[PDB]
Design a protein. Structure first.
Length: 128
């Protein structure tokens, strides 16, 4: 039915939503990320990363390891199923993945890899 969602990230270091449900009917699914903040990408760096909960941690750590020039995402991370590009206030981005990469029964989670954001910026993506 509906296969698009508008996820926001503000200067207060928080997503405008904390749960996404993807209609199995969707062949693909896209999320649009915008930054209604005022703080630049190096200060208030916001992105949207998807991955199962089991790897929500590592992906977040290794992502801290890398840096601004790496989008705070480790390069060649097979743990991430989909991801936006780290953006700063005023910016927007959207990623369109195939819902076939997702699986029913399995719990996925989306978050932000910028250091110190994943605590106040995560959620659950539900496939049903
Ligand atoms: Cu539809
Ligand atoms: Cu962030």
């Amino acid at each position: 039915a509906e296969c698009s969602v508008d996820i926001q990230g503000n200067d207060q270091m928080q997503f405008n939503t904390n749960a996404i449900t993807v209609d199995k009917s969707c062949k693909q699914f896209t999320v649009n990320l915008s930054h209604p903040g005022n703080l630049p990408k190096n200060v208030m760096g916001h992105n949207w990363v998807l991955s199962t909960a089991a790897d929500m941690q590592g992906v977040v750590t290794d992502g801290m390891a890398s840096g601004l020039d790496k989008d705070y995402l480790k390069p060649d991370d097979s743990r991430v199923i989909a991801h936006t590009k780290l953006i700063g206030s005023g910016e927007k981005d959207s990623v369109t993945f195939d819902v076939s990469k997702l699986k029913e029964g399995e719990q996925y989670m989306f978050f932000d890899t910028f250091p110190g954001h994943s605590a106040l910026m995560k959620g659950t993506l539900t496939l049903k």
